[model samples]
Target: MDTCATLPSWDASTVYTNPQQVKHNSKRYQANYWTQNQNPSTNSGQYGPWLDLGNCVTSGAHHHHHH
Candidate 1:
């Protein structure tokens, strides 16, 4: 299974259900709901062009199996 499965699908020309994650311009965007609600242009907003990896994932979710 894909780890990103928990997140929503990606489509630059499609609509999203909620604030989620997506990869664009070789970077991960948050798809910020608040920002979307404002409805800013494709190149004139705080996002500037998809919220870049502001805070990427950190480690500590993994575990080791003992046999």
Candidate 2:
């Protein structure tokens, strides 16, 4: 059996702010970036669903939420 590994983290705010841009970039990264850079041994890759709530907090917010 093989163990899974986490992928590198990406800060979306560095490149986008608008919801459309976020969605576009997320999809592009998943399809292109992952296909090219995903680790074969662990199948690790970075991705996001890119949710955009108009009044939501920015990426810089450091608060933690418990489910």
Candidate 3:
């Protein structure tokens, strides 16, 4: 089942702490430490404060754009 849709979308107004999970740009992420206003796509990594949980599975076509 897809629980990713049930997960809350990341809120810039919300202050996150360790273990707090949220979805951002079709992916899931967990806070490794206290963080605010930091986007998960850029902030999640081994050297970052957020832990990348993986992509949120969807039933439809994927969305993206080439630069």
> Which candidate wins on lDDT?
3
List the candidate 1 regions with Cα displacement exceeding 4 Å: 1-9, 34-50, 58-67
Ten contiguous residues with the weakest lDDT in model 2: 1-10
Give a tens-digit lDDT track for model 3, residues 1-67: 5677688766777677767668877668777777745555675454566767655653467566564
Clashes of each: 0, 0, 0
**Candidate 2 structure lDDT:** 0.31
TM-score of each: 0.38, 0.17, 0.54
**Tens digit of lDDT per residue, candidate 2, span 1-67?**
2111122234533443323322232222222221323332344334433432232223565678664
Q: Which pairs clash in the backbone of model 3?
A: none
lDDT of candidate 1? 0.49
Q: Report the lDDT of model 3 for residue 46.
A: 48
Best of the two (2, 3) by lDDT: 3
Clashes of 2: 0
Relative to the unseen true structure, what is the Cα RMSD of model 3? 10.2
